[PDB]
């Protein structure tokens, strides 16, 4: 059961890493959108 538990932990960790990467990408895109909006406001 140790190998199965290790595999389950690895799957959980990789799912968490994928979710964190997706959240980071969403935050980066939101920051880019906010910067573009600020640039548009500065040149309005």
């Amino acid at each position: 059961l140790g190998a199965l538990a290790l595999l389950s932990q690895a799957c959980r960790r990789m799912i968490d890493n994928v979710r964190y990467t997706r959240k980071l990408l969403m935050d980066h895109t939101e920051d880019i959108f906010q910067g573009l909006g600020y640039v548009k406001l500065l040149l309005d």
Partner: protein, 48 residues
């Protein structure tokens, strides 16, 4: 006739910001590719 001078000054002051922002995003695709490169290595390790 001051509107032309005002818009010329605004364009002159904004060209630097515009092309600086344009040049800052030139390396952005390369940064994204090099940040996603470890993901490919992890996928290869998982496949192995």
């Amino acid at each position: 006739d001051l509107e032309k001078n005002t818009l010329t000054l605004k364009n002159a002051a904004a060209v630097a910001a515009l092309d600086n922002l344009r040049g800052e995003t030139i390396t952005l695709p390369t940064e994204i590719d090099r940040r996603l490169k470890p993901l490919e290595e992890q996928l290869t390790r998982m496949a192995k």
